[PDB]
C-alpha cells in the first residue's frame, strides 16, 4: 500500500534527482558560456565600430570583457567538469594554468572597475587634478594586466595535481596551517572587500554630485553612465560574494572538513562557481538595457547575423 511510496522515494534519490541535477547544471553552464562569449564579443565590436563610443569608460569596459572572455573560454569548461566529477582530468600543467588564469581574470576585472570609479570620481567630484585620455587609459589597461599577471603567481605555485589511490585531484599544497589563512585573507580583501568598499564610497559621492545648457547636457549624459556603472559594480559584488565567503570559511576558518554534508558543500560551491561565470553574461546584458549606444550596436548585430 505504502510500499510504492518508498519505491518512488528511492527512485527520486537514486535517479530522478541526480539526473535532474546534472541537467540543470550543464544547461546553466552552457547558457552562460554561449551568452558570455557572444555578448562580450559584441562589446569589443561595438566599441571598435562606433568611434563615438571610444570613451575612457568604454575602453575599460572592453578590458573587462577581455577578462570575462578569458575566464569563460578557458576556466568555465574546466569548472564544469570539476563540479560534475569532483576530480581533475586535465593533467598536472593545466592544474596550475587554469586556477592561475581564473585568479588573473578576477584581479583584472576588479582592478578595471576600480580605475573606472577612480576616473569618474576625479572627473565629476574633483575636476582638473588629473587628465584622463583614451591614450592613457590604454596604458592603465596594460598596467592592470601586468599587475594581475604578477600577483597571481603564488596561486599557481601552490597548485598540485595529486593522484588518489585511479583519479587525480587539483588542490592547493600548503606547508603549514598559517600560510593559507594569511594568503586567503589577503586574497579576499585585495580582490573583493577593499576595492568594492572604496568603489561604493566613490559612487555614493558621485551620486551626490550628479543628483548652462552645455553643463546640463553634460550632467544628463554622466547620469546615464553612473546609473549603468553602479549596477555593474552592484551585480559584480553580488555575483562574487558567495564564492568569496565560501573560500574564507573554508581556507581561513577551517570549515567544510566533515564528509557528512559532502553533497550540500559541493552544491554550494558549484552554484557559487556558476555565479562568477554568470557575471560575464550579465555585463553585456546590463549594457543593453542601461546604455542606448550599446543597445543600438547590439540590435545591429542581431539584424546582420
Ligand atoms: C586593493 C586595491 C586598492 C586600490 C584600488 C583603488 C580603488 C579606488 C576606487 C574608488 C575611488 C574612491 C575615492 C574615495 C571615496 C571616499 C568617499 C568617502 O569619504 O566616503 C564618506 C564616508 O566615509 C566614511 O565615513 C568612512 C567609511 C569607512 C568604512 C570602512 C569599512 C568598509 C571598508 C571599505 C574598504 C576600505 C579600504 C581601506 C583603504 C586603505 C562619505 O562621503 P560624504 O560625502 O558623506 O563625506 C564624508 C562624510 O563627512 C562622512 O559622514
Ligand atoms: C571554479 C571557480 C570559479 C571561481 C572562483 C573564484 N574564487 C574567488 C574569487 C573569484 N572567483 C574559484 C576559486 O575558488 N578560486 C579561484 C582559483 C581557482 O579557479 C579555478 C577555476 C576553474 C577550475 F577548474 C579550477 N580552479 C584559485 C582558488 C580560488 C580563490 C573557482
Ligand atoms: C525551486 C524548485 C524546486 C527545488 C526542489 C529541490 C529538491 C531537492 S530534494 C534532494 O533529494 C536528494 C535525494 O538524494 C537529497 O540528497 C538532497 O539533499 C535533496 O536536496
Ligand atoms: C552533476 C552530476 C550529478 C550529481 C548528483 C549528486 C547527487 C546525488 S543524490 C543521491 O545521493 C545518495 C547519497 O545518500 C546516493 O545514495 C544516491 O545514489 C544519489 O543518487
Ligand atoms: C613547501 S612549498 C611552499 O613553501 C612556502 C614557504 O615559503 C609555504 O608558505 C607554502 O605553504 C608552500 O606551499
Ligand atoms: C592577514 C589576516 C590573517 C587572518 C587569519 C589568521 C588567524 C586565524 S582566524 C581563526 O581561524 C580559526 C581556524 O581554526 C578559527 O577556528 C577561528 O574562529 C578564527 O578566528
Ligand atoms: Cl579537483
Cell digits of residue 5: 511510496
Query: For residue 243, how far is its CA from the centre of ligand 4 (angstroms)?
Result: 23
Query: For residue 172, how far is its CA from the centre of ligand 1 (angstroms)?
Result: 34
Distance set, CA 293 to CA 53, 57, 68, 152, 215 (Å): 7, 13, 21, 35, 21
Q: Which protein residue's CA is at the shortest distance from atom 5 of ligand 3?
A: 17
Residues belonging to the binding site for suvorexant are: 247
Phi, psi of 172 (to 5 degrees): -80, 140
The answer to whether the CB of 185 is under 6 A from ligand 6 is yes
Between CA 8 and CA 119 the distance in angstroms is 60
Q: Which protein residue's CA is at the shortest distance from atom 2 of ligand 2?
A: 273
The answer to whether the CB of 102 is under 6 A from ligand 2 is yes
Atom nearest to 18 CA in ligand 3: 14
| Residues contacting ligand 4 via CB (< 6 Å) | 13-14, 17-18, 21-22, 25, 84, 263
Q: Which protein residue's CA is at the shortest distance from atom 9 of ligand 2?
A: 244
Burial of 200 (0-12, 13-18, 19+ CB in 10 A): middle
Q: To the nearest 10°, the Cα dihedral for 108, 133, 217, 51?
A: -80
Residue 10 belongs to domain spanning: 2-304
Structural domain count of the chain? 1
- CA-wise closest residue to 57 among 106, 115, 11: 115
Q: How was this structure determined?
A: X-ray
Q: Which protein residue's CA is at the shortest distance from atom 8 of ligand 4?
A: 18
Distance set, CA 62 to CA 53, 55, 98, 275, 287 (Å): 11, 11, 22, 21, 12
The answer to whether the CB of 240 is under 6 A from ligand 2 is yes
Q: Which protein residue's CA is at the shortest distance from atom 11 of ligand 3?
A: 13
C-alpha distance across the termini of the chain, in Å:
59
CATH number of residue 214's parent domain: 1.20.1070.10
Between CA 75 and CA 69 the distance in angstroms is 9
Q: Which of 190, 254, 255, 257 to mutate to test the pocket of ligand 6 (most atoms within 8 A of CB)?
A: 254
The number of residues in the chain equals 305
Q: Which ligand is nearest to the CA of 161?
A: 7
Give me the residue label for grid cell 558570455: 36
Q: State the resolution, in angstroms.
A: 2.3
Q: Which ligand is nearest to the CA of 187?
A: 2
Cα 108 off chain centre by: 10
* 72 Cβ contact list (under 8 Å, min separation 6): 32, 33, 36, 37, 40, 277, 280
Phi, psi of 261 (to 5 degrees): -85, 25
Atom nearest to 181 CA in ligand 6: 5
Spell out the SS3 assignment of the chain: CCHHHHHHHHHHHHHHHHHHHHHHHHHHHHHHHHHHHHHHHHHHHHHHHCHHHCCHHHHHHHHHHHHHHHHHHHHHHHHHHHHHHCCECCHHHHHHHHHHHHHHHHHHHHHHHHHHHHHHHHHHHCCCCCCCCHHHHHHHHHHHHHHHHHHCHHHHHHEEEEEECCEEEEEECCCCCHHHHHHHHHHHHHHHHHHHHHHHHHHHHHHHHHCCHHHHHHHHHHHHHHHHHHHHHHHHHHHHHHHHHHHHHHHCCCCCCCCCCHHHHHHHHHHHHHHHHHHHHHHHHHHHHHCHHHHHHHHHHHHHC
Between CA 258 and CA 246 the distance in angstroms is 15
Between CA 111 and CA 236 the distance in angstroms is 12
Between CA 99 and CA 275 the distance in angstroms is 17
The answer to whether the CB of 199 is under 6 A from ligand 1 is yes
Between CA 229 and CA 59 the distance in angstroms is 13
Phi, psi of 168 (to 5 degrees): -105, 155
Between CA 188 and CA 208 the distance in angstroms is 29
Q: Check: CB of residue 198 under 8 Å from CB of residue 117.
A: yes
Amino acid at each position: 500500500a505504502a510500499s510504492e511510496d518508498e519505491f518512488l522515494r528511492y527512485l527520486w534519490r537514486d535517479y530522478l534527482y541526480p539526473k535532474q541535477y546534472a541537467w540543470v547544471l550543464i544547461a546553466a553552464y552552457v547558457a552562460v558560456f554561449v551568452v558570455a562569449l557572444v555578448g562580450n564579443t559584441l562589446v569589443c565590436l561595438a566599441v571598435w565600430r562606433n568611434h563615438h563610443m571610444r570613451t575612457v569608460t568604454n575602453y575599460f569596459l572592453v578590458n573587462l570583457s577581455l577578462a570575462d572572455v578569458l575566464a569563460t573560454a578557458i576556466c568555465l569548461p574546466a569548472s564544469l567538469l570539476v563540479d560534475i566529477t569532483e576530480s581533475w582530468l586535465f593533467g598536472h600543467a593545466l592544474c596550475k594554468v587554469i586556477p592561475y588564469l581564473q585568479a588573473v581574470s578576477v584581479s583584472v576585472a576588479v582592478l578595471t572597475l576600480s580605475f573606472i570609479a577612480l576616473d569618474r570620481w576625479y572627473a565629476i567630484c574633483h575636476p582638473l587634478l588629473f587628465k584622463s585620455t583614451a591614450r592613457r587609459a590604454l596604458g592603465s589597461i596594460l598596467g592592470i594586466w601586468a599587475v594581475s599577471l604578477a600577483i597571481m603567481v603564488p596561486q599557481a605555485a601552490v597548485m598540485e595535481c595529486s593522484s588518489v589511490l585511479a583519479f587525480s585531484v587539483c588542490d592547493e599544497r600548503w606547508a603549514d596551517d598559517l600560510a593559507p589563512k594569511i594568503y586567503h585573507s589577503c586574497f579576499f580583501i585585495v580582490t573583493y572587500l577593499a576595492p568594492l568598499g572604496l568603489m561604493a564610497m566613490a559612487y555614493f559621492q558621485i551620486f551626490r554630485k550628479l543628483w548652462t545648457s552645455a553643463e546640463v547636457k553634460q550632467m544628463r549624459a554622466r547620469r546615464k553612465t553612473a546609473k549603468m556603472l553602479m549596477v555593474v559594480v552592484l551585480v559584480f559584488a553580488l555575483c562574487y560574494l558567495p564564492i568569496s565567503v565560501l573560500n574564507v570559511l573554508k581556507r581561513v576558518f577551517g570549515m567544510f572538513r566533515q564528509a557528512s554534508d559532502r553533497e550540500a558543500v559541493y552544491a554550494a560551491f558549484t552554484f557559487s562557481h556558476w555565479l562568477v561565470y554568470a557575471n560575464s553574461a550579465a555585463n553585456p546584458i546590463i549594457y543593453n538595457f542601461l546604455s542606448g549606444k550599446f543597445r543600438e550596436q547590439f540590435k545591429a548585430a542581431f539584424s546582420w547575423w
